[PDB]
Design a protein that fits this description.
The protein is mostly helical. The chain is built from 4 helices and no strands. It has one domain. The chain is 69% helix and 0% strand.
C-alpha cells in the first residue's frame, strides 16, 4: 500500500506552511511530478520565468527515479517537514 500512503502524504504535504524553504518546495514538486507523470517530456522554460524553470529543473533533477522510488522519497521528505514543522 505505497501509492495509498503517497496519496495520503501528498495531502499532508499541502497542510505544511508556505514558509518552508523553496529548496524544499522544489524537491517536493520534482518528486510529486516524477511520481505522478514520470520523466519530464516538456520543453525547459526560458530565462523570463525562473519559478517555471526552477520547477522544471527540480523534475529534471529526478528524471532517474522510478515512480515507486520517487513516491518513497516524497513521503520521507514530507515526514521530515511534518515532524520538523511540529517543532
Amino acid at each position: 500500500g505505497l501509492q495509498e500512503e503517497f496519496e495520503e502524504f501528498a495531502e499532508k504535504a499541502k497542510t505544511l506552511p508556505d514558509t518552508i524553504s523553496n529548496e524544499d518546495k522544489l524537491l517536493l514538486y520534482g518528486l510529486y511530478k516524477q511520481a505522478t507523470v514520470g520523466p519530464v517530456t516538456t520543453g525547459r522554460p526560458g530565462i523570463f520565468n525562473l519559478k517555471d524553470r526552477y520547477k522544471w529543473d527540480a523534475w529534471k533533477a529526478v528524471e532517474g527515479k522510478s515512480k515507486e522510488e520517487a513516491m518513497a522519497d516524497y513521503i520521507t521528505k514530507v515526514k521530515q517537514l511534518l515532524e520538523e514543522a511540529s517543532a
